[PDB]
Amino acid sequence: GKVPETHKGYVFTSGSSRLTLKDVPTYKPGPGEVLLKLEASGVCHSDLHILQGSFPIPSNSVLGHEITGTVVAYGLGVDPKTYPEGQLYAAHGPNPCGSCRECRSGKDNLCHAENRTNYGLGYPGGYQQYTLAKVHNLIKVPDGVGAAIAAVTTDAVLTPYHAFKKADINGLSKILIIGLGGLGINAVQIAKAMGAHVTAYDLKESSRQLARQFGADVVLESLTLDDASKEYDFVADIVSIQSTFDLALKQVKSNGLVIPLGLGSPKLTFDQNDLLVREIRILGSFWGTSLDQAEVFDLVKSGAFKPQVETGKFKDLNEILEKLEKGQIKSRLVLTDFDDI
Amino acid sequence: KVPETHKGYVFTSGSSRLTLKDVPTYKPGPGEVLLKLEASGVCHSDLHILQGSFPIPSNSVLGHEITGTVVAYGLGVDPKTYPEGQLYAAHGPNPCGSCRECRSGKDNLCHAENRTNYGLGYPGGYQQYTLAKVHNLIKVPDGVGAAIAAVTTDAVLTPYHAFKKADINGLSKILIIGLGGLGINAVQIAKAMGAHVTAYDLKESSRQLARQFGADVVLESLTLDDASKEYDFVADIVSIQSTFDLALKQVKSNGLVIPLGLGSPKLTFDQNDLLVREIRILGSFWGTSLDQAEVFDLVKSGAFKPQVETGKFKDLNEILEKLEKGQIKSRLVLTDFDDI
Amino acid sequence: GKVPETHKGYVFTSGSSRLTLKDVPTYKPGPGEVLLKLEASGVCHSDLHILQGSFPIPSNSVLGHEITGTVVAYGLGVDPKTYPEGQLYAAHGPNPCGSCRECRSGKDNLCHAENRTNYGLGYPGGYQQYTLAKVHNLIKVPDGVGAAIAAVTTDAVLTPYHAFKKADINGLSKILIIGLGGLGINAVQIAKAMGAHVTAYDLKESSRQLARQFGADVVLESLTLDDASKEYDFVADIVSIQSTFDLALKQVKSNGLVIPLGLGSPKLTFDQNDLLVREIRILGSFWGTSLDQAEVFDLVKSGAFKPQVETGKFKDLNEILEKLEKGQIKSRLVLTDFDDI
Amino acid sequence: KVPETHKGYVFTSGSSRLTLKDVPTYKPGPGEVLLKLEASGVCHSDLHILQGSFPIPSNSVLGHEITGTVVAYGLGVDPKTYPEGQLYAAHGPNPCGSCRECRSGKDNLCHAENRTNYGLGYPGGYQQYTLAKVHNLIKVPDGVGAAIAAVTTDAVLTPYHAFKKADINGLSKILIIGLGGLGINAVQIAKAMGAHVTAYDLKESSRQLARQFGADVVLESLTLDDASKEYDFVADIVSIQSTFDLALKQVKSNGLVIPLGLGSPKLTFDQNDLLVREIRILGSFWGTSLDQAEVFDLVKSGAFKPQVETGKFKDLNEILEKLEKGQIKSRLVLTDFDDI
Ligand SMILES: NC(=O)c1ccc[n+]([C@@H]2O[C@H](COP(=O)([O-])OP(=O)(O)OC[C@H]3O[C@@H](n4cnc5c(N)ncnc54)[C@H](O)[C@@H]3O)[C@@H](O)[C@H]2O)c1
Ligand SMILES: NC(=O)c1ccc[n+]([C@@H]2O[C@H](COP(=O)([O-])OP(=O)(O)OC[C@H]3O[C@@H](n4cnc5c(N)ncnc54)[C@H](O)[C@@H]3O)[C@@H](O)[C@H]2O)c1
Ligand SMILES: NC(=O)c1ccc[n+]([C@@H]2O[C@H](COP(=O)([O-])OP(=O)(O)OC[C@H]3O[C@@H](n4cnc5c(N)ncnc54)[C@H](O)[C@@H]3O)[C@@H](O)[C@H]2O)c1
Numbered sequence A, C: 001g002k003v004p005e006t007h008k009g010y011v012f013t014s015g016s017s018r019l020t021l022k023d024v025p026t027y028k029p030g031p032g033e034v035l036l037k038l039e040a041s042g043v044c045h046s047d048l049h050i051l052q053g054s055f056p057i058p059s060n061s062v063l064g065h066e067i068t069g070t071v072v073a074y075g076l077g078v079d080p081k082t083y084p085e086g087q088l089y090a091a092h093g094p095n096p097c098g099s100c101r102e103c104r105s106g107k108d109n110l111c112h113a114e115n116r117t118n119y120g121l122g123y124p125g126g127y128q129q130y131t132l133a134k135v136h137n138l139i140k141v142p143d144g145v146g147a148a149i150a151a152v153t154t155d156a157v158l159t160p161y162h163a164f165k166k167a168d169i170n171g172l173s174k175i176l177i178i179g180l181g182g183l184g185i186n187a188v189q190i191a192k193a194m195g196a197h198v199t200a201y202d203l204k205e206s207s208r209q210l211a212r213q214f215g216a217d218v219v220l221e222s223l224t225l226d227d228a229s230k231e232y233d234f235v236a237d238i239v240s241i242q243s244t245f246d247l248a249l250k251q252v253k254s255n256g257l258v259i260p261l262g263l264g265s266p267k268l269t270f271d272q273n274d275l276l277v278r279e280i281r282i283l284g285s286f287w288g289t290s291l292d293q294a295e296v297f298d299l300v301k302s303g304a305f306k307p308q309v310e311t312g313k314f315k316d317l318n319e320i321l322e323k324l325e326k327g328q329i330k331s332r333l334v335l336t337d338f339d340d341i
Numbered sequence B, D: 001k002v003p004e005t006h007k008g009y010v011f012t013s014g015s016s017r018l019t020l021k022d023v024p025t026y027k028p029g030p031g032e033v034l035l036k037l038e039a040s041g042v043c044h045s046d047l048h049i050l051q052g053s054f055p056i057p058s059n060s061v062l063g064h065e066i067t068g069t070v071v072a073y074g075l076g077v078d079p080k081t082y083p084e085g086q087l088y089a090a091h092g093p094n095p096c097g098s099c100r101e102c103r104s105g106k107d108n109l110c111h112a113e114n115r116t117n118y119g120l121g122y123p124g125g126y127q128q129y130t131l132a133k134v135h136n137l138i139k140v141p142d143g144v145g146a147a148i149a150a151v152t153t154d155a156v157l158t159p160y161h162a163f164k165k166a167d168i169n170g171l172s173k174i175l176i177i178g179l180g181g182l183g184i185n186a187v188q189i190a191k192a193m194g195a196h197v198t199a200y201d202l203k204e205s206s207r208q209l210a211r212q213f214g215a216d217v218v219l220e221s222l223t224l225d226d227a228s229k230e231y232d233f234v235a236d237i238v239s240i241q242s243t244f245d246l247a248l249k250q251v252k253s254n255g256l257v258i259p260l261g262l263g264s265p266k267l268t269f270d271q272n273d274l275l276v277r278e279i280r281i282l283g284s285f286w287g288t289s290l291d292q293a294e295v296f297d298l299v300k301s302g303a304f305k306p307q308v309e310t311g312k313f314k315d316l317n318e319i320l321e322k323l324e325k326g327q328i329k330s331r332l333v334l335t336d337f338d339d340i
């Protein structure tokens, strides 16, 4: 059908707690690009850190970085035959240039080439009715994967997956996972699938119930900095606020590994005496690469990864974001029904 | 003959000053030997012990850069194998030799309940005699003097361990912050592994020393306003917040930072930035006994030329003050354990 | 009780297919050593390669390198209190010096210091009533581990375990195991425990039945060099004769890993064109380290590793070796009842 | 103007000789560009193709060290971005850019059914014009001439890929067997990464060339009777049995051997010895596009000085014979694609 000249888009402005729905000129696809009519857009906590200030990005942007849609317009170099009408596609969040040094080494999650940015961090995001995508950054969603699970596997599944491959854990590893939410429950599933013994914490009774439901060999209901160390091979702190980071660096093994996978706090402090004497390793992990994306989609098709999404109204995004901050969402949430504006 | 008490320096918990007393000459247990101290290197970690940022139990002797001569044998030790008059160096961490960490090869990380590191509990080097588990001694190659050998076990060994953790070669570009006793050896080690070396210290003679030893670039200034030069590796051998902040701005994306120093007991980083750029922060502590062997090779061969000066045993307290005030050229080491 | 002045020992002589039982002066323990009265000695195929020539060692030696016994005499430096009467100990096969560069780096499986050799490869082995052991190379057998399983975990379990840690496989890896025998069935168990998808081959119906019984997700009954490649992450060839090596290098993944874990053939040929273009990796693996030994004994106590041994008569060693060459032994076999000479 | 046929060298399956014919000037497809060849390096792998030990489909053009100038644009390619008159180098493996292996970064290992490596099927360099997927072109830095640039994509790139697989630094001690076109660059690369380098070739001028370029030790003789000198790493860039046997005797315990050459299509090792000593044998093929970028940097900066001579296009068959008889000093590269 006909692509419109203007669509509705949630615009962020540096200084406002809420997103403003506005009228955006629908983008015309550049060379090597297409226009996606959004089918499902995942809501992510990082967007609350943006709206709150703790992760600053350019103003006057459309947020949203968990993107799934169909191609409805084609730029130069894209042959319409290559990308058929009706086919569901998922976008590679980081939106890599695909030809720079970070990209060509793998590590295209870390692209910082100057003619693009990460989705929902400047480049027009998922909280709108249409957005651009470079063809190189689109993956065909395998039949049987719903649009909503497909959206959230680009970040809620992808990110802990990339981090856990960093962790090089296996059936003899014993790992700890702090914070069990959108990423967290996927984190449990993928650690369990890699084979590791898993223990999981999260304040929400619902989220611990999901983790016990998902194979977490131990779902703890408490965790104080006087519960002596169980010397895990690997701690994934997926909230990463000073409270949980302190807990993690006490609970990890000598010469162990801690990944602060969350953006709970823009600064973070560690005991240096201990870090040094026990040769602790803290590793940054950011999103995941496009190879990682191909792999996780394979595993979601295989039923190994079974993401836990819920649908919601596009028009309700702001309200939905409110309930995310108060933590009244079971696992992740995804906007659908974009034509209800 | 072996006296029954000897003179030692005891850190008591609560004094910024070690006090010199008579301390009992311990009996060499099984597999142990009693050494008369020949050179005891002076490490800044000892100012951290005294000033209280690093806690060791009290009633303790604090030196941990140890070289000496066998002078009494415990049950199990063949004097043919470990002759009197032979200069040995001690392995500072003092591993047990048998636990999971020791058999891993990570024996710098031994926490076997049988022993503790030298000078963090176990009778360290700031005395006339100490004990050594002879699995933890290494024969000082002829040509290597006691002073340089004593510095080799820490001021060389520790940066050498760290820089092999860092996996750098002739193609790497790195930055070293801090050019004292560890730092100048760190310049030497990184150059021997091939890395292009950038170096910064506040002391001008430390900077010139880094120039002397082949540092490709000596920054005379380094502030947070300077643009990042994107090093593969940054070894911050100061490890206060100032230097850590610089290290995390100046390290390349997905790069490595090792805070090798103990300048501050707590450190904080930019979590947005460590996450987004997937930065690696790794602790690195002392060195392994395999590392010890390797570095004594590299010192014998002249690849490493540890920079030392000698002072009197009796002057330890004065020179430790000189070190806190940054007035030691590189590393100082005590000689003449008889003058008292 | 009283240690005797002479005991019975199976001596190998370069040139004879059979071991000769002889009268050996019982060894007097050196400094840091003890004398072990053997409780259980595992029989290993490598001993058939020694007897057959394909793995040459000094003549006039006692073979046997899977050793379990009790301490009955103490050398200088060993305090009798430290090593109590009646306690079962297992020996570290490679018999490392424990202070050289190979030893101090881990890798003490690769000790080649000049004042010792591997058990059953020069240094007096397990096919006798008593043998020496350095205290550093003895591990207390945890209560509940029988002497026979304890013997075979020093090599039948240890060796594939060390190799598979080399392989860095996890719940997402898919690996292939050729040859399912003494090592082979332990190999299956430990791959399954590390999490990997496992497919296993062996000519013996009994041994494939054991592998299907032990968790092998696929137990193949055939394998020809025209079964097209299933592109395994990792192939463990535990027979390593040219037949199986060719199979392995075709079946492995691009940039995959092949370990020839067997001594089936002293020479071995590979297609160089393929090895190069697909960046294949062939890795030698030998026995395992003493850290590895501590770990496998932990896991055997934990019931994770459940070795499959059978007892036999010391006096029947030679006959037993005959049935090993014709492959009429289910899994591994261990000599017991040493006082039946 | 772009001709509709050009002159090319076709390997036909069954001849030890490539034959020169007219071959159609292919039309640049989507994302592709048609280049006029400016320099085509001559690789010994081509003698292996001709002599039959390495099989490529027939009716093929065999050059794979490719540099040239854009001269026609296919659908999708902006001439502003890829100007005529600009010297590009091609990435020999010619990856698809999008498959699992390409996104891994292991794009030297691409086996996407869309394409194949240059000169093993895809219209290689032994002709006047070829096609390039412009994701697979790299702009030749000014100062770098076509000849050296064409050699940089293979004779430099391949040992550079291999030696980074080998993880060596200023502390490593290695041996290189084979000092032709790959080998002399391999000496340069290992020296740039810091390794102590030992080198052996049969040709004396190859040995002297290795001396020229800083090889620490040039063996004038190497036989199996020689004692093992226990190298961390051995790169056998001959890879016949003779040289492989030497490599596996001379490599240290738990050490690395890479048989980089294609001297023999099958190789055998001592299984007792590979097992007992836990030897690592690793294949290494071409280089990645990240590797390509890095090496063009290192050549521009003068860290790598690839050793080339130029000959006429028309003489390819004569010089390939000269190469089989070991009579090329290092690497030769074809110029003057107009003289015919
Ligand atoms: N690339 C990355 O590193 C990356 C990618 C995506 C998201 N993130 C960050 O991961 C974090 C979580 O992501 P999400 O979208 O799943 O958030 P979410 O709101 O879906 O899940 C949050 C969970 O955090 C739990 N929690 C909060 N504080 C806790 C505590 N102190 N102890 C135990 N549990 C606690 C809550 O109970 C909730 O179940 C956010 O910071 C998000 O921005 C990082
Ligand atoms: N296992 C380990 O990781 C390990 C082992 C031993 C020592 N250390 C630590 O290494 C650090 C240095 O030890 P040392 O004995 O070499 O000290 P030192 O006294 O010999 O010299 C330290 C150098 O730091 C320089 N410096 C101090 N602050 C600086 C700054 N803000 N910017 C630039 N340079 C600065 C000083 O000028 C001096 O040149 C100490 O914290 C010590 O405890 C760590
Ligand atoms: N450190 C080491 O690398 C190390 C250590 C111990 C043993 N080994 C070697 O491992 C090999 C096996 O050890 P084991 O003691 O378990 O032997 P074993 O006799 O107990 O088991 C042998 C198994 O090999 C199977 N087999 C033989 N040829 C086969 C083939 N072509 N295809 C499929 N299966 C085949 C047999 O059916 C039998 O089940 C021997 O070479 C042994 O010496 C190596």
Ligand SMILES: NC(=O)c1ccc[n+]([C@@H]2O[C@H](COP(=O)([O-])OP(=O)(O)OC[C@H]3O[C@@H](n4cnc5c(N)ncnc54)[C@H](O)[C@@H]3O)[C@@H](O)[C@H]2O)c1
Binding pocket: C276, D042, D043, D044, D045, D046, D048, D154, D158, D177, D178, D179, D180, D181, D182, D183, D200, D201, D202, D203, D206, D237, D238, D239, D240, D242, D243, D260, D261, D262, D263, D284, D285, D286, D323, D326, D330, D331
């Ligand atoms: N991807 C790869 O791994 C890859 C890529 C390109 C080329 N290659 C292979 O590299 C090998 C060499 O290529 P080149 O172009 O450098 O060859 P070249 O003709 O330039 O020189 C090869 C050198 O080998 C020396 N040599 C031959 N036999 C020797 C021996 N027995 N002992 C010592 N030296 C000997 C010759 O004297 C000559 O100096 C060939 O097999 C080539 O196919 C591999």
Ligand SMILES: [Zn+2]
Binding pocket: A044, A045, A046, A065, A155
């Ligand atoms: Zn997100």
Ligand SMILES: [Zn+2]
Binding pocket: A096, A097, A098, A099, A100, A101, A102, A103, A108, A111, A112, A113
């Ligand atoms: Zn990029």
Ligand SMILES: [Zn+2]
Binding pocket: B043, B044, B045, B064, B154
């Ligand atoms: Zn110190």
Ligand SMILES: [Zn+2]
Binding pocket: B095, B096, B097, B098, B099, B100, B101, B102, B107, B110, B111, B112
């Ligand atoms: Zn220990």
Ligand SMILES: [Zn+2]
Binding pocket: C044, C045, C046, C065, C155
């Ligand atoms: Zn065996």
Ligand SMILES: [Zn+2]
Binding pocket: C096, C097, C098, C099, C100, C101, C102, C103, C108, C111, C112, C113
């Ligand atoms: Zn040893």
Ligand SMILES: [Zn+2]
Binding pocket: D043, D044, D045, D064, D154
């Ligand atoms: Zn080539």
Ligand SMILES: [Zn+2]
Binding pocket: D095, D096, D097, D098, D099, D100, D101, D102, D107, D110, D111, D112
């Ligand atoms: Zn590809």
